[PDB]
Curated annotation (Swiss-Prot), chains A, C, D, E, F, G:
InterPro entries per the UniProt record, alphabetical: BMC_CP, BMC_dom, CcmK-like_sf
Record's protein name: Bacterial microcompartment protein trimer-2
Keyword set includes Zinc: no
The record's note on its domains: These proteins have 2 BMC domains which evolve independently of each other, giving the term pseudohexamer to the trimerized subunit. Although the homotrimer fills the approximate space of a BMC hexamer protein, the BMC-T trimers are more compact. Their universal presence in BMCs indicates their structural importance. The homohexamers form pores at least 5 Angstroms in diameter; in the stacked homohexamer 1 pore is open and the other is closed. In the BMC the inner pore is fully or partially closed while the outer pore is closed.
Similarity section: Belongs to the EutL/PduB family.
Organism: Haliangium ochraceum (strain DSM 14365 / JCM 11303 / SMP-2)
Reported phenotype of the disruption mutant: Not required for efficient BMC formation; when deleted from an artificial operon (Hoch_5815, Hoch_5812, Hoch_3341, Hoch_5816, Hoch_4425, Hoch_4426, Hoch_5814) being expressed in E.coli, normal BMC shells form.
Swiss-Prot record, chains B, H, I, K:
Location in or out of the cell: Bacterial microcompartment
Outcome reported for the amino acid change (mutating R77A): Forms smaller hexamer patches
Role: The only hexameric shell protein in this bacterium, it forms the majority of the bacterial microcompartment (BMC) shell. Expression of 5 proteins in E.coli (BMC-H (Hoch_5815), BMC-P (Hoch_5814), and 3 BMC-T (Hoch_5812, Hoch_5816, Hoch_3341)) forms a 40 nm artificial BMC with a molecular mass of 6.5 MDa. There are 60 BMC-H hexamers per BMC. The shell facets are 20-30 Angstroms thick (a single hexamer layer), with 1 of BMC-T trimers protruding to the exterior.
UniProt-recorded name of the protein: Bacterial microcompartment protein homohexamer
Xref: InterPro entries: Bact_microcomp_CS (IPR020808), BMC_dom (IPR000249), BMC_shell (IPR050575), CcmK-like_sf (IPR037233), CcmK/CsoS1_BMC (IPR044872)
Pfam family, any one: BMC
Length: 203, 92, 203, 203, 203, 203, 203, 92, 92, 94, 92
C-alpha cells in the first residue's frame, strides 16, 4: 500500500479536542494527550492498520470515517510512548520508514483583513467550529495531501491567541480556516506555514 | 492613545483610493485630510495599533497603482502632547 | 391567535447576528442592525402575522418557524425608524398592546464553573455557535416564552467579551448558553437576570 | 426534580454496545464494560447531574439527549464499584435513594411471527441496530419509563442468540425491537419480562 | 387502537403521487393507483394493523410512521377492489366499523393574495412539493385530526392545474398548501373545504 | 490562481430564486435583479475573492460553501452596473481578462419524452426543485466546468414555458434537468444548448 | 457513451434486498428476484437508459441517484426473463456488445480476525447494514469499478453464514465489509475474491 | 453609496473640458472641484457606477487632448466614512 | 432623462425579436416603435445605461439570426431638447 | 402568455394566403397585420406553442408558392412588457 | 380536434413495432389500423399536436430497423369532414 501522511502530534492544545471531537463520532480525544496521523487510500487499508496499532498498544481511535472520500486514521492516548509505539507498527506493516512520506505542497495561504459583516455569517454555514466575529481577520490554508492540516491547526493556537475555525484533513487537499484579531493571525500563519515546510519527505 | 497611520500623496485622487482602501481593509477611522499646498495631500487614519499597519500597507499597495506615493508611516502610540497641537482627529 | 412575546433589541450584538445567522434559513441578518422579534400562538397565524408585516414595510424577513403549537416571525433592519411603524402594523392587527404581551419569567438558571474536558466533548457537540472549550465556565439561563432569549443574550454579550456557545429561542422555552472566564461570566449572569427582571408584560 | 430511572448494568453485552455507538455522540462505549444510565426530569439539571457524577467518579458520558421535559445521561466504567459511585452519588444527590426510581410495568408486548416483506422494508429503515432480514420473527416491546429499556437488550443478547433491530431509551416510552428465528425470540420475551418484572422502584 | 381517520382514495391524481412519492420510504405508489389510508391511535398499535393486512393481501405499503400517539398507514395497489378487503378486515381487527371513525373538521382556511417574495424564500425552503414562485396565490387549509389532509390535496389537483407545495398527514393538524394564480387557487380552496363536510364520523 | 467560470446574469427569470434559494444558505437573491457566479478551485481563493467584491460594491451573496467539492461564489443585486463592477474587480485580483475562462463543452444533451410513471418519483428523490409530473418530458445537459449551468437554467425559462427540475453549478460537471409539456421542452433545451457554445474562452 | 459495469443478478439472497433497499430511496427490491447493474459515465445517461428499460419491459428500479458521484442503475423484477430482456436493451442503447465492460481490478483483499472491541463500534458509524460484534472477524475488499461489489457481495452470503456490513456499488471504487465468526469469512472471502476474477472483460 | 469618478489635472482648463465632457456623456452630478495648491485641481462626480465608468473614460479622452492629465480613478462605493469627512458632495 | 437604446431592422420581425430579447435581459421599459417607411422600423428602449448596454447586446445578438440589422446604438444621457421634440416616450 | 408567430412578406397577396393556411393548420387566432411601408407586411398569430410551430411552417410553405418571404419567426413566451406596447392582439386594457 | 399521426409500412410486423413505439413515446391514443391490401398496412394515432409529431418521428426510427417503411405523415388539426367520413377514431 502507498503512503501520503505520517504526522506525529506531541500534546494537543485545548480548543482542538473540542473541534476535533465535536466533529468526530469515535473515541473523542481530550486536551493534553497525544495523537497520531497517517494518510492512506483506500479507507479499508486504514481499518486493518487500526488493529495492528490497537492490538499492539494501549491507545484509542477518534477518526475512522468515510464522510469525505476514503477514510483516514488517527488514534489518541496520554502517554507519548504508547502513541510512538502505535506508529511503529503501522509503518512496519507497510515496511517503510518515516522519510518515505510525500513532501507537502503549500497551495493557498492568505490572510484577509476586516472581513465584511456579510461574509462572516455565511462562512459559518459550515459551522464545524467557531464563528468569525464581524470584521476581524481570517487566515486560510490549502495543502496536499489533506492530513497535514491538523498539525498546522495545532501549532497555530499553540503559538498565538486565535479562535479556531474549521479543519480539513479530508479530501483531495487539506484546507484550513483561522480567525481572530489582526496581529495574532500573522503570528499564527507565520508559525503555521513554517510547520509544514520543516517536515522532511520525498517529492 | 489610538495609533496613527498616514499617507502622503502628490495627487488628490491618489489619496482617496488610498484612503478608501484603508477604511475598507481594517477597523480604522478616517479623521480628515491636511493639504500642505503644492498638490501634496496627506490622509490620516487612527485606530488600533495593528489595524493601521494592515490598513496602511493596503493603501500603499493600492495608491502606488494610480499616484505618486510619497511617504507611508505608522505611529503606534503618539505622545499626549502631539494630539494637543496637531490636527490629527484625537484632539481633546 | 395569542401574541406571546414581542421584545425589541436596540441593536443586535456582534455574535448573535452570526449565531442567529448560523441557523436561520431566510434572509440572513447583518451586524449592528436594530431588530424586533415577535412571538405569537398558534403557529398557523405566523404566516398571517409576517404577511401583514412584510406587506406593510421594507423590513427584512429572517425566520418563520412552525413549532408544536405557536409560530414566531422576527424581522430586522438597520433603520430604527421602521420598528415603530412595522410593530404597530403587526401588533395593532393581532390583539396586543405593548404591555399586553406576556411578561417573561425566568424558568431555570444554573452556572457550572470550569467545565472539565469530558463535558467539552458532550457540551458544544450539540451546539452550532462557538465551541465550548475545556476548562472554561458556562452559565445557563432559560426564558419563557422561547422568543425572549434574544434579550438575555444580546444584553450579556454586549457588556462583555464572552463566547456564545448556543442559543435556540424556538420551541416552548428558549435556551441561552454563554461561555467564558469566571469574571466575565460573573457580571453577565448579573446583567442577564436584571435585564430579564425589568421586562414588562402580562402573565 | 423527579428521578425516573437509574440502572447500573453489571456488564453490557457484546451486541448492544455497538448500538450505542451507532447512536452516541460522545465518547463511544466498549464491549464488556459495566454501564449506568440515569434519566431525570427536568432536563436542565442533567448538565449539572452529569457534572456531579463526572467530578465525583471516573464515569464517561456516552449519550445526552435534551428532550421536551426529561433528560438522559449514560455512564460507563470498567470498575463496577466506580460506576456505582457516580450512580450512588447521583442517586443520593437529590437526597433520594434506590426506591425513588420508577417501578417497571410491562407497557406493550407483541410477537409478530415471520416478518413480512412490507414490514421488513419499514422496520430497519427506522432502525439503527441490526437489519431485520425477510422471514425472521420480530418482537416489538415497550417499557415505561424509557430508561429501564437497557435491561431488555442486556437480558436477551446474553441469555439468547437474538438480533437487536432497534432500541431507543430517550423519550416518553422506550422501544425495543429484536429480530430472529421463532425459537430464540420466544425465550427472550420471558427473559426480558423477568428482569422487567423484578425491577425495583416506586411509582 | 382507536380509529382516528380512514379515507380511501379512488385513484391517486397525477401530481400528488410525486409528493407522496417524494417522501415515502416503503413500497412506492404510482399515478392512477387506488389507495386507502387509515389513521389510528395509539401509534404504537399501528405496526400490527399493517403487519396483519400485508400478510393477507397484495397491497403495497407507502408510509407507516409511528409517532408518540397517532399512527398513519398507507396502502397502494392498482386494483381498487382489493382495498375494501383489508380495511374492513383492519377495522374488524381493532373492533370498529365505518361509523366508528372520527369526522374531519376544517380548522382554518385562508387565501393570501400575491404571496410576497420574502415568504417564498421561507415558504419553499421548508417544502418538498413544487417550488412557490413569486406572484402566485397560496391556499392553506388545516384539518383536525391531521389525517384528513390527504383528501384535501387529491381534491385540489384534479379540478385545476395547481401546484402542491407541501403535505404532511402526520401530526395533530394536516397542512395542505397549493399554489397557482389567484383565480385558480380560489376554486381549488373551495374544493378542499367541502371535503371536510362530507367525511363521515364523530367529533 | 486559475479561473473556471465568469458568468454575468442579466435579469433572472422568477422561478430561479427558489431553487437558487432552496439550495442556498446565505443571502438569497430575489427575482428581477442581477447576480454573479464564480466557481474556482481551490475553494478558498473564492473566500478572498468575495471580499474584493463585497468591499468594493453594494452587493449580497447566497452561495459560499464546500458541501460539494471546492467552493462556489455568488453575489446578487438589482442594478446590473453595481454587480458588473464587482465582477470586473474579481478578475483584476486574479489579473486575468474575460477570455481566460474555459470554453464550455456540450457532452450529453438529449430530449426524453413521456417518462414512465415510475421514474418521476425517483428523480424527485433529488427534490431540489419542482417535480417531473408523470409523463411530461425531460431534457438532460452536461457541461464542463459546472458554473456554466445556471446560465442555461436562466436562459431556459427565459425562452419557454417550463417547470424547473434541478441544476448543477456544483460538482466536477454541470448537469441539467428540465420538465414540462413537450413543445416547450423542445423550445427550451434548443435554446440552452445553443447558449452554451457561444461563450468565448480557451480550450 | 462509455461502459464500465454490466452485472446481471440471477436470484438475490435474502438479507441483501433489505440492505439493498433500506439503503435505497427508490423502488426497493425484495429477496428472490433478479436485478441488473450497469455503470456508465457520465451519470446522466443512467437517467435516460433507465427508461429504455422501463419502456420496453415490466421491471422496477431501486438505485437511481447522484448523491455520491455520478449515478448508477439497477432495475429489479422476479422473472429472470424480463431483466435479461431489459439488459439487452441498455447495452443496445449504447450500440455496444456484451464484452465491452472493463476487467475489474482487485486492489486490497485481506481478512481480519478477532477485531479489538474498539474498532467494531466505530465501523457501525457507517451503519448501512449489520454490525461487527466485538471479536468476530472482518473481510475488506476493493475493486474498480464500484458496481461489481454487489456481485461480490451476493456470491459471499450465498455461500457461507456471514453477516453483511456495508457496500459501495457507488463511487470510483468498490469497497466491501463483512462480519461473522471465523470459518465463514474464510469460506466467504474464498468465494468473493474469486467472484471478481472470473468476470471476462476488456483491458 | 453613490459611486465616484475623479480627474486631477495640473491646470484649470483641462479640468473643465473633462468635467463638461463627463456630465454630457452620462447621467452624473458634477458636485464641485478641489484646488490642492501648486496648480493641481480635481473634478469630482457622483452617480451610478455604469455612468461614471462610461463618464470618466469619456472625459479623460477629451481632457488629455489639452493638458497634463495626472490621474483618473473610479470608486464604486466610497466607505461611508469617506463621504462623511471629505468634500465629495455627500457629507451628511 | 434616462438613457436610451435603439435597434432598427428593415423587417418588422427583426424589431420584435430584438424588442423581446432586450426586455427579458434587463430592467428597461419598451416605449414603442417608430416606422420610417420603406420597411425600416426602429424599437426604442429606455432605462439606466448598464441596463440598455446589456439589453442592446442581447437584442443585436438575437436579431442577427433573422434580420438585416441596420444600426445599434446607445445614448447614456440625451440632452433635454431631444426628448422634448422627438418621440422617445419620456416627453412631458 | 399566448405564443407568437409571424410571417413577413414583400407583397400583400403572400400575407393573406400565409394567414389563411395558418389558421387552417392549427388552433391559432389571426389577430391582424402591420404595414411597414415598402410593401412589407407581417401577419400575426397567437395560440399554443405547439400549434404555432406547425402553423408557421404551414404558412411559409404556402406563401413561398407566391411572393418572396422575408422572415418567419416563432416566439413561445413574449415578455409581458412587450404585449403592452406593441400591436399584437393581446394588448391589455379593456 | 386532436392531431393525427400515421405510419404506413409494407409489413404487418413493421406496423406493430411502429405502433408500439409511438404510444411508448408520448401521450397518444392508438385507434386502430386500416389494411389497404398488398402487404401495405397503416397505423393511426391521434392526440395532442406535438405529442404526435414527437411520437411519429419516434415510430419511424423504430420501424425503419425491421421493415419497408413507406410513408410517415402528421396532420395537426384535420377538417371536421375528415373525421366524419374516414375511420380515424374521432367520429361521433
Amino acid at each position: 500500500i502507498t503512503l501520503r501522511t505520517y504526522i506525529f502530534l506531541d500534546a494537543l492544545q485545548p480548543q482542538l479536542a473540542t473541534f476535533i471531537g465535536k466533529t468526530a463520532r469515535g473515541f473523542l480525544p481530550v486536551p493534553g494527550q497525544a495523537s497520531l496521523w497517517v494518510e492512506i487510500a483506500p479507507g479499508i487499508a486504514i481499518n486493518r492498520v487500526t488493529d495492528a496499532a490497537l492490538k499492539a498498544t494501549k491507545v484509542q481511535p477518534a477518526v475512522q470515517v468515510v464522510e469525505r472520500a476514503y477514510g483516514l486514521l488517527e488514534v489518541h492516548h496520554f502517554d507519548q510512548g504508547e502513541v510512538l509505539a502505535a506508529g511503529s507498527t503501522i509503518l512496519d506493516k507497510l515496511e517503510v520508514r518515516e522519510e518515505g512520506r510525500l513532501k507537502p505542497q503549500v497551495m493557498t495561504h492568505q490572510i484577509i483583513r476586516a472581513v465584511e459583516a456579510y461574509q462572516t455569517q455565511i462562512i459559518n454555514r459550515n459551522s464545524q467550529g467557531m464563528m468569525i466575529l464581524p470584521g476581524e481577520s481570517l487566515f486560510i490554508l490549502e495543502t496536499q495531501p489533506a492530513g497535514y492540516a491538523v498539525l498546522a491547526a495545532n501549532e497555530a493556537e499553540k503559538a498565538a491567541n486565535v479562535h479556531l475555525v474549521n479543519v480539513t484533513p479530508y479530501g483531495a487537499f487539506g484546507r484550513l480556516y483561522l480567525a481572530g484579531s489582526e496581529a495574532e493571525i500573522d503570528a499564527a500563519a507565520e508559525a503555521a506555514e513554517a510547520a509544514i515546510r520543516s517536515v522532511s519527505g520525498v517529492a | 492613545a489610538d495609533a496613527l497611520g498616514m499617507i502622503e500623496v502628490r495627487g488628490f485622487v491618489g489619496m482617496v483610493e488610498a484612503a478608501d482602501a484603508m477604511v475598507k481593509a481594517a477597523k480604522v477611522e478616517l479623521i480628515g485630510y491636511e493639504k500642505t499646498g503644492g498638490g501634496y495631500v496627506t490622509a490620516v487614519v487612527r485606530g488600533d495599533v495593528a489595524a493601521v499597519k494592515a490598513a496602511t500597507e493596503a493603501g500603499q499597495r493600492a495608491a502606488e497603482r494610480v499616484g505618486e506615493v510619497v511617504a507611508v508611516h505608522v505611529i503606534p502610540r503618539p505622545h499626549v502632547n502631539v494630539d494637543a497641537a496637531l490636527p490629527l482627529g484625537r484632539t481633546p
